[PDB]
Design an enzyme around this catalytic site. Structure first.
Site, mmCIF file in Angstrom:
data_model
loop_
_atom_site.group_PDB
_atom_site.id
_atom_site.type_symbol
_atom_site.label_atom_id
_atom_site.label_comp_id
_atom_site.label_asym_id
_atom_site.label_seq_id
_atom_site.Cartn_x
_atom_site.Cartn_y
_atom_site.Cartn_z
ATOM 1 N N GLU A 135 0.829 -1.196 0.000
ATOM 2 C CA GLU A 135 0.000 0.000 0.000
ATOM 3 C C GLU A 135 0.868 1.252 0.000
ATOM 4 O O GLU A 135 2.060 1.189 0.282
ATOM 5 C CB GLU A 135 -0.921 0.010 1.230
ATOM 6 C CG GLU A 135 -0.188 0.001 2.567
ATOM 7 C CD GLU A 135 -1.093 0.357 3.734
ATOM 8 O OE1 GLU A 135 -1.756 1.413 3.658
ATOM 9 O OE2 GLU A 135 -1.141 -0.405 4.725
ATOM 10 N N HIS B 163 -10.247 4.946 4.629
ATOM 11 C CA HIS B 163 -9.396 4.214 5.564
ATOM 12 C C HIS B 163 -9.618 2.698 5.570
ATOM 13 O O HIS B 163 -9.819 2.093 6.627
ATOM 14 C CB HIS B 163 -9.570 4.764 6.986
ATOM 15 C CG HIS B 163 -8.344 4.629 7.845
ATOM 16 N ND1 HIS B 163 -8.405 4.424 9.207
ATOM 17 C CD2 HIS B 163 -7.025 4.695 7.537
ATOM 18 C CE1 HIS B 163 -7.181 4.367 9.701
ATOM 19 N NE2 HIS B 163 -6.325 4.529 8.709
#
EC number: 3.1.27.-
Lengths: 89, 110
Positions: B73, B102
């Site tokens: 990520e 998120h």
């Protein structure tokens, strides 16, 4: 930083994430999931950190294996090097 | 320096060069430079940088898993201060996803 969880008050996995949000001063956008928790414990939370989890067993009930999965992220964060002390009482 | 930190900029770069743009550094590297997440000081100790490149364990199992595939990520739209809620997710076989909430939900973009 200090964080307290009263296990007997956790009625859902949702309760658990919101309690953590408060206790750890997580961002308002906190995803309330395992990935967001890991991200918070490794790129947001203050250290050293102390998590005191009271009545862990009782919270393990009303959340299924959820409590266990959350605990594993904390242990995983510790293994990553984060200065986190976990008290399971 | 020419910072590339948008979903499509990084996504394109990821697929064309199989690596993140130069404005990305891992959590560990940021730390070695003096980054203290709770201080929101990343821009102070590493101007123009964003956290990116760390392994993504896909703990909720929301992204498609497969033998031999590992996910990573990288922060998106970050400039300075405390980290936001945007992330780009890329696998070893170059599947690209994104999240702006998120990690609650993901959208495949490549």
């Amino acid at each position: 930083k200090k964080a307290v969880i009263n296990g007997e008050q956790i009625r859902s996995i949702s309760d658990l994430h919101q309690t953590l949000k408060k206790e750890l001063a997580l961002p308002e956008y906190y995803g309330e999931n395992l990935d967001a928790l890991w991200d918070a414990l490794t790129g947001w939370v203050e250290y050293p950190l102390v998590l005191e989890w009271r009545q862990f067993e009782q919270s393990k009930q009303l959340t299924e294996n959820g409590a266990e999965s959350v605990l594993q992220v904390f242990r995983a964060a510790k293994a990553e090097g984060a200065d986190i002390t976990i008290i399971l009482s | 320096a020419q910072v590339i930190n948008t979903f499509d900029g990084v996504a394109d770069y990821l697929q064309t060069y199989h690596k993140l743009p130069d404005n990305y550094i891992t959590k560990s590297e940021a730390q070695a430079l003096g980054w203290v997440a709770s201080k929101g000081n990343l821009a102070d100790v590493a101007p123009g940088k964003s956290i990116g490149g760390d392994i993504f364990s896909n703990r909720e199992g929301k992204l498609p898993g497969k033998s031999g595939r590992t996910w990573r990520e990288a922060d998106i739209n970050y400039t300075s201060g405390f980290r936001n809620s945007d992330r780009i997710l890329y696998s070893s076989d170059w599947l690209i996803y994104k999240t702006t909430d998120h990690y609650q939900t993901f959208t495949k973009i490549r």
